[PDB]
């Protein structure tokens, strides 16, 4: 019960600091000070454990993001869309990018990555609908459409940065994200 | 001279129909009815040949796209951004997506893919600047910024479709692309 949770917490620590490849059952058992037998008893597979820890860390990232103070949903959206660059979150963002590569070769991470994407979309929907209900955002298009378009934009922009194109500055990410938020909602 | 061009044309045929893995020097020599020795004489490496053929096919896609009749840059942008779904272009688009995966393991395709991305960006810039000069598009932001944002959007939207998320319809691609074009330029 709580002992299962402490195994999960050990796995999350390794995930943040060292990534998925380091999260062997042997490693996690040593870090949790338990037996590999009890790790296997509590988790259906090593990949199940990796996916469970990943989802837990993403909810933790959600919690952390919710402690930064905001007075507008405009500010909230910048944080949710990753345009704020909080050094506290960089290991969580490194893990997210790591998980993105594993969805093609790990069935449990594939499902967990999509669950986190759906949660991200819902957090952005809630922010848009709160901003609209509070009179700050306009009602041009429906909130589900805008949320997917915002996610598509920031994911696509990061993808273009990964290419190493000439004459394209990663530093412009915030400026571009602000422009799209403004066009869609202000 | 022309014989080098005929080898290139044979490589392009295989590329369109069967992809990069089929483009061995042996295969291309057979299809061009030449010797492997003359293929190696004209091209520094098999990967050089693959990249050269890929770039040639992308210019061919540009040419094909320019034969569809338009009366507005709004229409032109939909074609350039892939929102029109022309069945003639589906093998070219399959090759583009194929090349995207090879940039991490083939040095020549890596460079050629970025060259094609820069050409795509310039084609979109030219379309925006023509539409602005013709009075059809507004001048909210500069054309280089808008072009990168448009490319980021459509690449990001296709990336999200690849995930197989629930409650997200690939059929909405045109509708979303139109909305972003309208917000940025109309």
Description:
The structure is a homodimer of 186-residue chains. Helix content of chain A is 72%, strand content 0%. The longest helix of chain A has 27 residues. Chain A is elongated, with a radius of gyration of 19 Å. Chain A folds into two domains: 43 residues, Arc Repressor Mutant, subunit A; 139 residues, Tetracycline Repressor, domain 2. With 186 residues, chain A is an all-alpha fold. In chain A, helix 2 crosses helix 3, helix 4 runs antiparallel to helix 6 and helix 7 packs across helix 8. Chain A has nine helices and no strands.
What brief labels describe this structure?
mainly alpha, Arc Repressor Mutant, subunit A, transcription cis-regulatory region binding (chains A, B), 9 helices, Tetracycline Repressor, domain 2, 186 residues, DNA-binding (chains A, B), 2 domains, homodimer, TetR family transcriptional regulator (chains A, B)
Helix/strand layout:
The structure is a homodimer of 186-residue chains.
Chain A: H1 2-18, H2 25-32, H3 36-42, H4 46-67, H5 73-80, H6 90-102, H7 107-133, H8 143-161, H9 173-185
Helix pairs in contact in A: 1-2, 1-4, 2-3, 4-6, 4-7, 5-7, 7-8, 8-9
